[PDB]
Design a protein around this ligand. Structure first.
Ligand SMILES: N=C1N[C@H]2[C@H](COC(N)=O)NC(=N)N3CCC[C@]23N1
Ligand SMILES: N=C1N[C@H]2[C@H](COC(N)=O)NC(=N)N3CCC[C@]23N1
Ligand SMILES: N=C1N[C@H]2[C@H](COC(N)=O)NC(=N)N3CCC[C@]23N1
Ligand code: FES
Ligand code: FES
Ligand code: FES
Ligand SMILES: [Fe+3]
Ligand SMILES: [Fe+3]
Ligand SMILES: [Fe+3]
Lengths: 320, 318, 327
């Protein structure tokens, strides 16, 4: 559709690299734009990410097929090379295709095993994830979670910490320890950082957490106990103003065998969050100024800072 | 889909049956485009709270929470709201007095006739009268609720209409062999709309009164017994209704199953018409479809449309 | 609904006559209008096509019943004769029904075994289909295909010929024969005509070696197409009609005739069913849903020479004043 510039000119994850096999075609949606992702059959071939649209008669290129190093539209068979240019119009095999005959292409980077996409001019870097190449850390990926909520509501819920003893009771919080101790929040040029805060729970029931968003739809979260360190990179694909795809990449320095339990814990807490997110009204995130206005208490300082940050960045897409 | 019409916002509407609201329970309803939460504490004889179904902290429906002692507890961060709607406890700051704004939006509620009546505005008018409720000679019964995809004013218009009886109610309220409708009287004044006595030839004498444009008090009488009912139409929005009937009669109590079946048969015969009617809003008088036609036997539905215009109704009409 | 007079003042197929038995009641939708089709029980009774609406309290007359030569509303039993005039108000059997007690009636004509309807004042005539009266030709009707696309996109796809060797590979074309030979197109007093166009394919309805086919078509009406497909061994003609339900939905029907053995009917229906469904898969996917007209978000349409017919179609639609379901 017509997102804002801080969104258009930023990188977003739209798929896992394992979803794009050689020779394959897959689809995604980002900020209202339909995307086609494709690869040739060659070893280690790159991923192309284009608007899913043939400009001849408006057919989705994702309904075609990969032939050699080209994507072929199914309707009249126009072939597009890896750079998106039409190289052949079969009805007129000796005709030079017109210059307008070209797919709209976008920037694509593989990083952390994820497929990152920028629909505009990539002025920002992909958020950093320092544990990625650390040999002491194993990795696992959650499945994708399609969520019927504004992406900025999804992230709001991920910055919120006082909800742990309620919807995450027995997982991330304790019904009997509801008080939220003071913590610090800074918004500056590194984005939003929420400082260390302790919360009592087993998954050894003492975990210190902090997290940083250099990017309003990506969160780097660190949770450390004396026994082990777990970090994750949470990415929210903003499908449109009202729908999101959540993905989490998780790394931990404990035993490799803990993987199956890691995914079960995340799956349980994510679905606990999704139940709330689908229920929230209005579905779009209200900024700081029918339905009453939002109320803020001191433990909301992080989510208040998020709303202030979004207003400062000029976000108008998926908010109110 | 909400209204400012005073005769609607400043009036009482049935949203539920009291049997559906047990102690410690949480139920939901919609009225005039507003989502409601109904809840009671676990105490015997506890009152029924009727609030907008909405936590002002982060906008979660309160109806997804639980009842704890005398409070409704939001599931997201556990804020606790007392029976008066005031937040009494915010668990992340156990010693803090909640902000004054930490309050549920509460509505007037009154139990009457075994029904839960709600006023979203300023309760000017009283709940409709139902004289037989106090008469120990009359048994009572409640139909199930009927959700109807039609304007509430179309639903009431169909309930004031009498000439359709020999057609869609053939064999139940009329007879296809006696289709002529005899003369009858209708009055609209300070007490609302009153339809005088009428009767249909078959092979029962009736009258009814509306003081409230979405409630109807019906009287039907035979030599054998007398039946009265209070039909209420909850206006969910401009295009959807919930119809309920409270039926009272002074014959044998054992007639209950048959009466419920007869009502069910004729109500469903009406719903088949109501769901099909075009346009869905009720057309008022003298305003790509032609204007309605009125014949003498439509005098009651004509008077109903005149009454709604005098009352200034704009919601659910056209 | 549309003010476009070329649509309102034209004829459109809404049913097959075989779908309208004596005494029957059926429904259809046309240009946003809900229709009721009904016939008396008498043999050879005419077909009435009315707005599906009782002017008393707004009930669909299609929910009623046919009694003698009247259609009876189910709600209060008012009876409407074949001309749409209410002749009986059962609540007041002696009253003179008011002049307003009258169904909205539309012009209806049966032609080629199809039910044609005009919602307005018919300027144009029903398109002509010369082989209808030729006794050398056998006929068959496809079933009706409901398509979630603009009627003008559906017709665009039927005027298109370069797509045959791709989505009709193995049926109307050959992935080894993708070049589209030159052909002519005219927009004039006859409407839109595509001149003879030869293409390479063997077909299920003819001999293995009979693989050089020649197509031709004419539209005098923007949503009906008369197509002729001819080889040295056989000649096949069809009348395709597209009923514009609304701006975004259409019903396609095809009446097929051929100068050959009546035994070929099953293979004829198989070929048309296979190819129509291949077209529908594309039609459902195209964006935007309305047909973009010519004009020197989404990029603009690109045109190459083999698009000369679909370009002429878009030009013709602007000359005719079409605004419904386009752009
Ligand atoms: N499902 C979730 N589990 C939690 C873990 C805690 O962090 C770590 N690194 O274990 N990760 C994470 N990103 N957050 C943000 C909100 C709470 C949570 N969401
Ligand atoms: N289904 C319906 N049964 C009838 C009964 C009247 O019968 C009694 N016994 O009061 N109740 C009622 N509200 N009305 C209004 C019109 C006809 C009717 N609708
Ligand atoms: N599904 C379709 N089958 C075809 C038949 C004859 O076509 C051929 N090529 O024999 N009839 C017809 N009107 N048309 C227009 C487009 C192609 C076609 N659509
Ligand atoms: S629509 Fe893609 S080649 Fe024609
Ligand atoms: S949303 Fe209700 S307590 Fe936070
Ligand atoms: S609505 Fe058709 S007869 Fe009354
Ligand atoms: Fe959570
Ligand atoms: Fe009725
Ligand atoms: Fe085709």
């Amino acid at each position: 559709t017509t997102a804002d510039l801080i969104l258009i000119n930023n990188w977003h994850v739209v798929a896992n690299v394992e979803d794009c096999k050689p020779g394959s075609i897959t689809t995604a949606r980002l900020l209202g734009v339909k995307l086609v992702l494709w690869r040739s059959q060659e070893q280690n071939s790159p991923i192309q990410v284009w608007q899913d649209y043939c400009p001849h008669r408006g057919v989705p290129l994702s309904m075609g097929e990969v032939a050699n190093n080209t994507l072929v539209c199914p309707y009249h068979g126009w072939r597009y090379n890896q750079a998106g240019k039409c190289v052949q119009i079969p009805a007129h095999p000796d005709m030079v295709p017109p210059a307008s005959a070209q797919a709209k292409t976008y920037h694509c980077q593989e990083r952390y095993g994820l497929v990152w996409v920028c629909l505009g001019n990539p002025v920002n870097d992909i958020p950093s994830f320092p544990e990625w190449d650390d040999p002491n850390y194993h990795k696992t990926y959650t499945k994708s979670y399609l969520i019927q909520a504004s992406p900025f509501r999804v992230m709001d819920n991920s910055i919120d910490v006082s909800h742990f003893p309620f919807i995450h009771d027995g997982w991330l919080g304790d019904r009997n320890y509801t008080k939220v101790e003071d913590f610090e929040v800074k918004v500056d040029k590194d984005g939003l950082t929420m400082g260390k805060y302790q919360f009592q729970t087993s998954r050894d029931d003492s975990w210190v957490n902090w997290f940083r968003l250099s990017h309003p739809l990506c969160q780097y979260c660190v949770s450390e106990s004396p026994e082990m360190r777990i970090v994750d990179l949470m990415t929210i694909a903003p499908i449109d103003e009202d729908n999101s795809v959540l993905r989490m990449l998780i790394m931990w320095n404990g035993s490799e065998m803990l993987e199956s339990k890691m995914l079960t814990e995340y799956d349980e807490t994510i679905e606990q969050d999704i139940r709330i997110l689908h229920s929230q009204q209005p579905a779009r995130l209200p900024l700081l100024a029918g339905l009453p206005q939002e109320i803020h208490v001191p433990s909301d300082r992080g989510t208040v800072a998020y709303r202030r940050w979004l207003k400062e960045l000029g976000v108008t897409y998926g908010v109110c």
